[PDB]
Structure formats: C-alpha cells, structure tokens
Chain A
Amino acid sequence: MLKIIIPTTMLLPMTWMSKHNMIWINATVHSLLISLISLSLLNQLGENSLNFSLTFFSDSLSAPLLVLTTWLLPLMLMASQSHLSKETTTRKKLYITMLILLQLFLIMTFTATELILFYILFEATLVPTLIIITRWGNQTERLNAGLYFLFYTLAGSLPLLVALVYIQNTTGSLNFLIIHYWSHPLSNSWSNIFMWLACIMAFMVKMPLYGLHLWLPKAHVEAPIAGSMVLAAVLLKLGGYGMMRITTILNPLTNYMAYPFLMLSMWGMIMTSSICLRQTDLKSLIAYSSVSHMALVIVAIMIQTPWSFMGATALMIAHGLTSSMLFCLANTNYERVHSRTMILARGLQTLLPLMATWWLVASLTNLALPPSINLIGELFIITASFSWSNITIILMGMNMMITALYSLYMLITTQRGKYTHHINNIKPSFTRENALMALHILPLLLLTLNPKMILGPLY
C-alpha cells in the first residue's frame, strides 16, 4: 500500500521545488501516474481482503473509492488552474499542497485496518478542506460556511471517539478483522442504545442525513471548484464507508434503532428532490441533488442486505463522478458570467454546442438512465427496499419522478430557449474544459461494461 502512499507524499516536494510555470504540468502528470498505479488495487479476492500489513488493508469496498480519489486529484488540478492564474507562485503551491494533503489523508483513511487510525485520518481530512473553503472561496459567506462545515462534523465525531475507546476497553482491540471475527450481539439496553447512537451519528452527519444536512448547501456553494468536487465526490462517501464498517457490531440493535433514520431518509429524499424544483442558484440545486442521492444510500446501508450494500457501493461511485461533472459544468458558466443565478444565462446550446452535449450526458446520468451504474445502484437499493417493505416503492418511485423533473429542468433552463441579449462575453469552450468533462464522463460509461468492479464485497 506504500507504493501508493509514498509517491503521493513525494508530490509535495515535487511541487515545492518546481519552476513557477511548471507546477500544474508536473502535478497533473504525476497524479495521473499515481492513479494508474492505484488502478492495480482492483484485483480483489472474494473470500477475504488484501491485507498488505498490520496497518493497511484493501477490500472490494475500499479499492473503487481509492481509485476515485486518485483519479479526482488530476481533475481538480485541471479545474483549479483557470481561476488561480492571477495567484502568486507561493499561494498556488500552497493550494496544490492542500489538495495533495487531502488526497493523502483520504487514501490512508480508506485503507486503515484499525478504527482509531481511521478516525484520526477521518478527522484530519477536515483541515485542508476548511483551509481551501475559507481561503480561496469567492464570497463573504465562505467563512460562515467553514464554521458550519466544521462544527457539524465535530459535534458528530466527538461522541464516536468516546465510543471507540470504550469499545477497545471491553473488546480489547479495534482491528477491523478482529472486530468482524469476534463480533457479538448488542443487547436491548439504554447503554447499548446510546453506544449505537455514538457509533452512527458521525457518519449520519457526514452523509448528510436529512435534518443534519444544512452545512452541505453552504459549504458546497461557497467553496472553490476543487473544494466542491472533492466534497461531493469523495468526502460524503466517508460517511457511507464508515457505516458499512461499523454496522458489523451493531446487530441486532439496528433492527429497530434504524426506523427514525429510515423515515428521515425516505421523506427527506422526497423533500430535497422537491427543493431542487424551486432553486435560483445552480450550485445549490446540485448540492440538494447530492443530499437526495445520499439519503437513498443511507436507506441501503440501514436495511443491511447484500443487495442493498451492493447498490450503495455502486451509487456512491456513480454519484461521485456525476456530481463532480455537474459542478464543473456549472463552474464553466460561472467563470463566463460571474453569477450563479440559473436564469441569468440562457439558450447556451446556441452558443456552446459541445458543452451542451456534456450538460445533456451529465443530466442523463443524474436521473439514472439505463444501463448507467447510477441506475444499477438505484435499482438494487429499490429492490432491497421493496423486500424490506413493499410500500417503500411508493416513495422510491416518487423520488425517481422528481429527480427527472429537476434534472431536465436544469438542462432546459440553462441550455434551451433564447440567449440573453446583453450577455456578450461568452467565449468558445477551451480544450481544458472539454477535456475535463470527457475525463469525468468516459470512465463512468466504461464502468457499465464491468459493473462488478464497483459492486463491492457482497458481489
């Protein structure tokens, strides 16, 4: 596993000793090479995980997430260099350093064998994101956003830490293999109920669960483009992955402790999809769409079935790619017109045809068109939910409708109609932007040919 970690660490002195006009080229090339190397973790076993050492291990759940992280770094670098051109050399290197440190923390987080190490890296991911949002965000709200991003996370994660150390006092270990092999049922007691809540609520906040989600619209809207890309594509999944690891010690308590969270997820999925229908800010719409998809992921993890776990893994990967692409698409128009109001710039298909094609494909994957992996995950989760209770289809189907209704709505508002007359500074699409869209969209489509590679351990 060090064959991934050490090159990522070497990215830091490489960017700090590069020429002033070579930082982007070097960082992009070497992050792409690191992604190519990380692509070898996809060879998984079935029976058990790849246990490299006492500290790091790779699973069929971890490997797609690691590949997505390593692939997302070069895309973030490509998307950042446009609006950071006027920046000084030192601050550009500091921005790249924040991105590299975030990738390093995420890579170590997804492969830690022991739950305290996972928790420490899980919290360590906070600091670079906070610095990125509050230093390179554009508006005055970013500061408030940063605070919301911070104290929502910590207020959830501080109890988890306590629970974790408590567990190691009674079990004797926090190694995940030992935890899984020596797992014992949780009795029906108040102490067990509160330990369950302490083990779950941090990942709930990270998802975010409906009702604990107010930090996400602020943080994703106010962040720079690379911040939004990493926040939506990878950071949210830190919750899901965490849940998939920690529910192994929460049975059979989850059989009834999950009812309020399931109700919140289903109803708030309806609520956030409906919120997307009346949204004036284009980034806010994408953020709320992420909330709805993550609610579906929460339902999948809470019902604890192999089909639901497979669907949750697939949906996590697919949503990461799609939401990153949508954020980049919105940022292109924002850099055109310096406003996030969705109705300001209209009829853009007339002026930017290829970018309109990119918009269309992103909207199609957002509404889960078959046979995309978005629908693969969604359908697996819906089938598992139907087995859990047949009435769930009523909500699930409703969500589907609303999702399409807002997706095309976005597409119709920004691409169709007539162009705004007074906006006359809409330049042709750069090769950088088109390449970024392609590098988002093509892996997503290729994953359809080999879906099992993202279906997780339960496959």
Chain B
Amino acid sequence: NVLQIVRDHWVHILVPVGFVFGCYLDRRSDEKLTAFRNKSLLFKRELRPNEEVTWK
C-alpha cells in the first residue's frame, strides 16, 4: 500500500535532505578554517585535561 504513495510523495524529502547536506557542508567548510583555533590573544586558553579542541 506504501509503494504508490512513496512513488508520488518521494519529492517531499528533497528539501530536508538538502538542508541536512547543507549543514554537513557547512561543518566541512568550518574544518578548513582552524588555523587560529585556540590561538587568538583574546580567547587563547589552556586545554581541559580531557578535551582535544576548543571548538569544531
């Protein structure tokens, strides 16, 4: 019973998948701009004993 309704309603996930993919690509783009992570004179900080990065 779900085959035909899926075949006529699968276009309803295109935009949510686009949103999720855009969020993923924003995170990937963030990964390329970490040259000054925990290195600014204003926010430079000693790491906690367990954390590896201040932000990601």
Contact = CB atoms under 8 A, between A and B. Distances in A.
Contact, chains A and B (beta carbon distance below 8 A) = yes
A10 interface: yes
Interface in A24-38: 26, 30, 33-34, 37
B17 interface: yes
**What is the interface residue range for chain B against chain A?**
10 to 19
B46 interface: no
Nearest to A34: B15
A13 B22 CA distance: 16
Nearest to A23: B11
B22 A5 contact: yes
Contacts of A7: 15-16, 18-19, 22
B50 interface: no
A351 B23 CA distance: 50
Nearest to A26: B11
Given A6-B21, A10-B17, A53-B33, A26 B12 contact: yes
Contacts of B40: none
B8 A19 contact: yes
Contact of A6 (B11, B18, B33): B18
A81 B17 CA distance: 27
A6 B14 contact: no
Nearest to A15: B11
A52 B17 contact: no
B55 to A, nearest CB: 14
Given A2-B26, A52-B29, A37 B19 contact: yes
Nearest to A1: B26
Nearest to B17: A10
Given A37-B19, A53-B33, A10 B14 contact: yes
Contact of A17 (B11, B15, B17, B33): B11
Interface string B23-37: 101100110010000
Contacts of A26: 11-12
Secondary structure type dominating chain A contacts: helix
Contacts of B15: 7, 10-11, 14, 30, 33-34
Given A10-B17, A52-B29, A53-B33, A2 B22 contact: yes
A255 interface: no
Contacts of B17: 10
Contacts of B33: 53-54
Contacts of B16: 7
Nearest to A52: B26
B37 to A, nearest CB: 15
B29 A13 contact: no
A13 B12 CA distance: 11
Interface of B: 8, 11-12, 14-19, 21-23, 25-26, 29-30, 33
Given A10-B15, A53-B33, 12 more contacts: A2-B22, A2-B25, A3-B19, A5-B22, A7-B22, A13-B14, A14-B14, A18-B11, A34-B15, A52-B26, A53-B26, A54-B33
29 contacts: A2-B25, A2-B26, A2-B29, A3-B22, A3-B23, A3-B26, A4-B22, A5-B22, A6-B19, A6-B21, A6-B22, A7-B16, A7-B18, A10-B14, A10-B18, A11-B15, A13-B11, A13-B14, A14-B11, A14-B12, A14-B15, A18-B11, A19-B8, A26-B11, A30-B15, A37-B19, A53-B26, A53-B29, A54-B33
